[PDB]
Amino acid sequence: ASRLYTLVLVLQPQRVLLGMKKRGFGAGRWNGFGGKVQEGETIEDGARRELQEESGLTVDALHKVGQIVFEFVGEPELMDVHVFCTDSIQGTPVESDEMRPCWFQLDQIPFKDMWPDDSYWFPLLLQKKKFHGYFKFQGQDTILDYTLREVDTV
Numbered sequence: 001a002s003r004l005y006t007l008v009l010v011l012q013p014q015r016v017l018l019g020m021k022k023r024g025f026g027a028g029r030w031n032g033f034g035g036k037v038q039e040g041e042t043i044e045d046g047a048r049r050e051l052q053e054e055s056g057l058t059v060d061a062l063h064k065v066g067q068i069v070f071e072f073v074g075e076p077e078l079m080d081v082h083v084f085c086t087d088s089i090q091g092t093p094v095e096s097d098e099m100r101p102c103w104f105q106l107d108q109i110p111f112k113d114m115w116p117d118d119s120y121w122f123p124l125l126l127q128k129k130k131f132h133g134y135f136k137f138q139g140q141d142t143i144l145d146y147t148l149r150e151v152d153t154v
């Protein structure tokens, strides 16, 4: 019992784009752009669609970088998050009622204001490593247990 989600990081040589979510699940945290995958849509097509919806940016080629499964204790459905990166975008990041994008220098990534799992796998993303992860949360702040391993094929 898992549900597909996407997460996209626009990662350029000296900066990364994050978005501050204004409402719903994850509100108040910086994160990549993503969401649920639709019926009849490929995971990558869903990732591209969500990037546009939430940031205003058009991506063509997305690179698979990771898969992270999230368990929230007391919730039956696991979240199967497919993580992608891109360095080539078109458009200017757009702030909306749902999302405030901002560029960050790589030495200023706002980990204290991100989901806590990001502190484990974001350093792999920055060094161009691919990974498979599993994080068991209690609520939205506490990691009870986790696994995270580098892989050659996502």
Ligand SMILES: Nc1nccc(-c2ccccc2)n1
Pocket (backbone or CB within 6 Å): 005, 006, 007, 026, 031, 034, 035, 070, 081, 115, 116, 117, 118
């Ligand atoms: N970084 C991070 N950590 C935990 C959960 C998520 C998430 C990703 C896609 C959709 C909803 C939540 N992202």
